[PDB]
Amino acid sequence: STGSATTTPIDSLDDAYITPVQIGTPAQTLNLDFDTGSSDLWVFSSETTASEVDGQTIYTPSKSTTAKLLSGATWSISYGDGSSSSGDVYTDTVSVGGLTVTGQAVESAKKVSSSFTEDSTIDGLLGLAFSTLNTVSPTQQKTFFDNAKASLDSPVFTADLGYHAPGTYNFGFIDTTAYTGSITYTAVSTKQGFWEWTSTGYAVGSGTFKSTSIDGIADTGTTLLYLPATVVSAYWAQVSGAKSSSSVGGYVFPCSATLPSFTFGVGSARIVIPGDYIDFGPISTGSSSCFGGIQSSAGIGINIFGDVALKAAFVVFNGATTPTLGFASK
C-alpha cells in the first residue's frame, strides 16, 4: 500500500504545516501537524476543556463506530518550545492520503497549553519520530508510520515541504518526479528517539564551504533552523545591521536587507536554502526589524533541521531495519 497527502502552510510565514487526516467511522477529518520530532498522535476532542478550544475541529469518539477507549491509558507531553498537552486514549481507524491503519492510538486531549489554543488552524499533531518517544502510559503505543510499515510497498515516508506554498507527504514510495539529481543518503542514530544525523558542513552565500560535523535532527515540527552559535554568527555577520536581541529572543535584521543563501552538507552533496526562506518578517506588526530564520541552538541542547532547512529539499525518512535519511535538491 501507499498514501499521499497534501500539506499546507498555516500562515504567510510557513510557521507550520497542516495535513488532512481521516479519523473514525464515518470519517472525521482533522488538520494535523505532521511532526518528525515527536511520536504521539493527539487531537483536540469532545473531551478538551472548553475554555481551551478556540476554533479547532474536534474529534468526537462517541460518534465513531470504530472508536474504543484504551482502558486505563493516559498521555502527557511537553515540547521543546514549552507547549504541552495531555489526556486519555482511544484506538480507531486512521487514514492519511488513502493509506489506512486500523487500531491506531488516537490520543484525546483533555488539556492543551495556550499556544495550541491560540493556533486555530492546528487540530492536533501526528508524530513521526520513533515509537520509543511515545508518551502513552502504562502501555506505550506505536506511531502511524510504525503501524503502517509492514503494509507499505517500501518502509519509507517522504517530506516535500513548500516555500509559501503547498507540498506533499508520501508514505510507502519515492516520487522520482519530485526532485532533481540524486538522493544522497546519510546515517541515522535512533538513540534519542529522533531522526538524528550528521551534516558535513555549511556555506554562507557564495562563500567557501566549511567542512565540519554538525549533529542534528530532521524535525518537520520545528519552524526554524537551529545551529551552533559559531555557525549562526558567521551567517548573520554577512547581513548589514543584523544583531542578536535578547529582548526579542534571537537574531533580527533590517527588513530592508537582502539575505544571503545558506548551504548545508549531506555527505558530499549540498542543499541550498535561498535567502528568502530565512526571512520571517517584522518582529511586531509594522516594525522595520525582521526575525531571522536561522537561530542559535545554544541552550536547546541539540541542533534542529526544521522547516527552514527541510523545505529546501526532498527528504526521505527511511524506516528500514537500519534507518537512514535521504536528501535531494528540488
Resolution (A): 1.7
Residue 194 burial (CB count, 10 A): 23
- Equal fold, 5-174 vs 175-330: yes
Strands (E), 219-261: 225-227, 243-245, 250-254
Solving technique: X-ray
Residues contacting 146, CB < 8 A, separation 6+: 130, 131, 319
Residue matched to cell numbers 535521504: 326
Q: Which of 14, 33, 35, 160 is catalytic?
A: 35
The three-class DSSP label of residue 66 is coil
* Alpha-helix runs per DSSP H in 32-143: 114-118
Residues contacting 278, CB < 8 A, separation 6+: 225, 259, 262, 292, 293, 294, 308
What are the sequence ranges of the domains in the chain? 5-174, 175-330
Cis? peptide before 20, omega within 30° of 0: no
Known catalytic residue at 206: no
Question: Nearest 5 degrees, angle CA 279-CA 251-CA 186?
Answer: 70
Tell me which DSSP letter residue 22 carries: E
C-alpha cell at 99: 493509506
The domain made up of 175-330 has a fold known as: Cathepsin D, subunit A; domain 1 (2.40.70)
Q: Which of 45, 64, 85, 199 is catalytic?
A: 199
The domain made up of 5-174 has a fold known as: Cathepsin D, subunit A; domain 1 (2.40.70)
Known catalytic residue at 88: no
Q: Is the dihedral of CA 46, 11, 304, 293 positive or negative?
A: negative
Buried b (16+ CB within 10 A) or exposed e, 221-258: bbbbbbbbeebbebbbebbeebebeeeeebbbbeeeee
C-alpha cell at 27: 470519517
**Among 29, 34, 38, 280, CA closest to 160:** 34
Instruction: Confirm if 296 and 227 have CB atoms less than 8 A apart.
Output: yes
Residues contacting 286, CB < 8 A, separation 6+: none
Question: Nearest 5 degrees, angle CA 310-CA 314-CA 318?
Answer: 95
Query: Dihedral angle at the C-alpha atoms of 147, 134, 214, 320, nearest 10 degrees?
Result: -20
